[PDB]
Every structure is written in structure tokens, then in C-alpha cells.
Design a protein around this ligand. Structure first.
Ligand code: T53
Lengths: 11, 268
């Protein structure tokens, strides 16, 4: 999923 | 002419690098050489000096909730997590990066961060040790080596890479562009759209080439030496990734941070 990485990138 | 656009790219990357990474190579070198008006870093060369240094380096601030080799590793882990955050912020400043497909941004970061971590460690390192805790500590190479397996072997390949990589004598303005090039590698496994990545990297490499010509005119084919190290580094990171997956499974009392798990899962 890469949930945290996604969060760091989008925000 | 076209050089001017490349020079502006170099400068834009420098400025964003400076914002993204609080501890620059310049600051780290100032510290390591004593060309600084701040106090000298506390030296941690053994068990007892680790205990003695705890206030100066704020070692108990890692675990607000263990064995030593584990505690040192958690410290390393703590900083790595922040390094991934800094690398991620810097990546967003690279022109074109955030218009890439979000799965590709993720993939580029997932493979790139470990390579960049090696270059970040090199800035903090000499032959004998590594700066820790925001420059307040210095942990010797032999102390890290003397840790029990598998922790004893973890930092040493990064020391090996660093001594070679440091002989190139890059500064922050070089590094800013080199790091951009690593991130935008169109040959990472699982990339959807290789083309807009390679288009960006092409401009970054040209920027890197010109930067190195201008900043190191006496150093013939530094660009070439640099690209060869970048290839060496991929090969090296494969073994680093292997050792962590080993440690995760083989050490029960050590928790691997979720972000770091994300970046180690399904990797080589
Ligand atoms: C190490 C272990 C595991 C991984 N991993 O990917 O699973 C990565 C790393 C790692 O790469 N470390 C790393 C990456 C980039 C830059 C530095 C870095 O590291 C530095 C390092 C290396 C070896 C040992 C240590 C030990 N660190 C500490 O003991 C430590 C103590 C305290 C703090 C922060 N603390 C005090 C300062 N406050 C302001 C904040 C709280 C940090 C580290 C570190």
C-alpha cells in the first residue's frame, strides 16, 4: 500500500 | 544560453536542498574539523562513554517507552525515518516530480531513499566514525563494528562507501543535483511511465555535468567518476536491504518503524 509515503507525498 | 536554464535548475535545487536538509555537508565538515565556534561533539567509543554521553546526545529521547546494540540501532532508525521525510520533501521540489503518477513518485522514493541515505551518511562520516544527534555526538567506527551480530556489520559497508565517496570532495551544491538524479531513475522496477522520469533526469544530468565543470574545473571527469559511484551504490544497497529483512525477522525485541517497513517490503 505505502500508506505513510503516500501521506508524506500528498500533504 | 541553454546553460543558463541548467544553472537556474542547479540553483533552485540548491535552495530547496538547503530548506529540506537542516544539517548540510558544510555544517558537518565544520564540526568534524573543529572550524566551528560550537562545542566539540561527545565521543562515544564504548559502552561506558555511551552511558556518559546520554545528556549531550539525548539518547533517552529515542525510547520514551533494552539491550545496547538494539538501542543504538533504534537511534539510527529514528534518524533514518526523519531522513526519509527530508528526502521526500526535497523530491517534491524537483521540477516535474509531483506531476508524475503518484505510484511512480512512491516507487522512485522507495528505491531512491537508501541510496541517498548512503550519501547523507558520507557527509557525516570520516574514516573513524559518524556524527550523530544533530552533530552533538560522534560514534566511532570500531564501537559500531564491536556490536554483536548482526548489528556489528550494519554500519561498516556505509563507512567503506563513504571513504571512497568523500575523496570526490563534492559540496552541497553538487550533492543537491546528484541526489535529484538518483531519485529520477527511469529504470526502477515497477515504474508505470518511464518517459517523463527520463525526460527530467536528462535535464538533471546536464545540470549536474555543467555544475561539476564550473565548480570543479581542475577535476577532469568528476562527472564520470560520480556516475560510476552511483552505479556501485545500487549494487551496495541491495546488500543493505537484505540485512534489514534479516534483522526484522531475526530480532524479536526490536520493532522496525512502519515507514521503514513500507520501504523495505517487496524490494530486491
Ligand atoms: C540506521 C538503522 C536502521 C536504518 N533503517 O533504514 O532501518 C537506517 C539507519 C540509518 O540510516 N541512519 C541514518 C540515515 C541517514 C542519516 C543518519 C543516519 O543515522 C545516524 C546514526 C547512525 C548510527 C547510529 C546512530 C545512533 N543515533 C543515536 O543514538 C541518536 C540519538 C538521539 C537522536 C535524536 N534525539 C536527540 C536529538 N534531539 C534533537 C532529537 C532526539 C538521534 C539519534 C545514528
Amino acid at each position: 500500500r505505502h500508506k505513510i509515503l503516500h501521506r508524506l507525498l500528498q500533504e | 544560453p541553454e546553460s543558463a536554464d541548467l544553472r537556474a535548475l542547479a540553483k533552485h535545487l540548491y535552495d530547496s536542498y538547503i530548506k529540506s536538509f537542516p544539517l548540510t555537508k558544510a555544517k558537518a565538515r565544520a564540526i568534524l574539523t573543529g572550524k566551528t565556534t560550537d562545542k566539540s561533539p561527545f565521543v562515544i567509543y564504548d559502552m561506558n562513554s555511551l552511558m556518559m554521553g546520554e545528556d549531550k546526545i539525548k539518547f533517552k529521547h529515542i525510547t520514551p517507552l533494552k539491550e545496547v546494540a538494539i538501542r543504538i540501532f533504534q537511534g539510527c532508525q529514528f534518524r533514518s525515518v526523519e531522513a526519509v521525510q527530508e528526502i521526500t520533501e526535497y523530491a517534491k521540489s524537483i521540477p516535474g516530480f509531483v506531476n508524475l503518477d503518484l505510484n511512480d513518485q512512491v516507487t522512485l522514493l522507495k528505491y531512491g531513499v537508501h541510496e541517498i541515505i548512503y550519501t547523507m551518511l558520507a557527509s557525516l562520516m570520516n574514516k573513524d566514525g559518524v556524527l550523530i544527534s544533530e552533530g552533538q555526538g560522534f560514534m566511532t567506527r570500531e564501537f559500531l563494528k564491536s556490536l554483536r551480530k548482526p548489528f556489528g556489520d550494519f554500519m561498516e559497508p556505509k563507512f567503506e562507501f563513504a571513504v571512497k565517496f568523500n575523496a570526490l570532495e563534492l559540496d552541497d551544491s553538487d550533492l543537491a543535483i546528484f541526489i535529484a538524479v538518483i531519485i529520477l531513475s527511469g529504470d526502477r522496477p515497477g515504474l508505470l511511465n518511464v518517459k517523463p522520469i527520463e525526460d527530467i533526469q536528462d535535464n538533471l544530468l546536464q545540470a549536474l555535468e555543467l555544475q561539476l565543470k564550473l565548480n570543479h574545473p581542475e577535476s577532469s571527469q568528476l562527472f564520470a567518476k560520480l556516475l560510476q559511484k552511483m552505479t556501485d551504490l545500487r549494487q551496495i544497497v541491495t546488500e543493505h536491504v537484505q540485512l534489514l529483512q534479516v534483522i526484522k525477522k531475526t530480532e524479536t525485541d526490536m520493532s522496525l518503524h512502519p515507514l521503514l517497513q513500507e520501504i523495505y517490503k517487496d524490494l530486491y
